[PDB]
């Protein structure tokens, strides 16, 4: 019942894309972490995951109390969204993302 984003160690807050790249360097596919969006706008976040030995940038949109990777937004929290994709591949959004959120980089 604790859906707090601060409570998740895969959430790193105000770190840069370069800091994310440091943490994903030489990591296995399915490695992931979330940081604040570079814009700092509408309470958005940015998911970065490892796929093909490369770092894939995925916006977490936040609008009218909900979250998701594309409209329609159907998740009530960032934690619910990320938890969902621990066990579902992201391939429906893009066939290049046939991967799960397996291995958090933890603060």
């Amino acid at each position: 019942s604790n859906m707090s984003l601060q409570n998740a160690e895969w959430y790193w807050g105000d770190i840069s894309r370069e800091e994310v790249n440091e943490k994903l360097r030489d990591t296995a596919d399915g490695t992931f972490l979330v940081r604040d969006a570079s814009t700092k706008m509408h309470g958005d976040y940015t998911l970065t995951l490892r796929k093909g030995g490369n770092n894939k940038l995925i916006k977490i949109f936040h609008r009218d109390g909900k979250y998701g990777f594309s409209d329609p937004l159907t998740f009530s929290s960032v934690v619910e969204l990320i938890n969902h994709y621990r066990n579902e591949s992201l391939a429906q959004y893009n066939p290049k993302l046939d991967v799960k959120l397996l291995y958090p980089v933890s603060k």
Partner: peptide, 8 residues
């Protein structure tokens, strides 16, 4: 941008 395009 460098972001992934995510199907709606």
């Amino acid at each position: 941008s460098d972001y992934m395009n995510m199907t709606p």
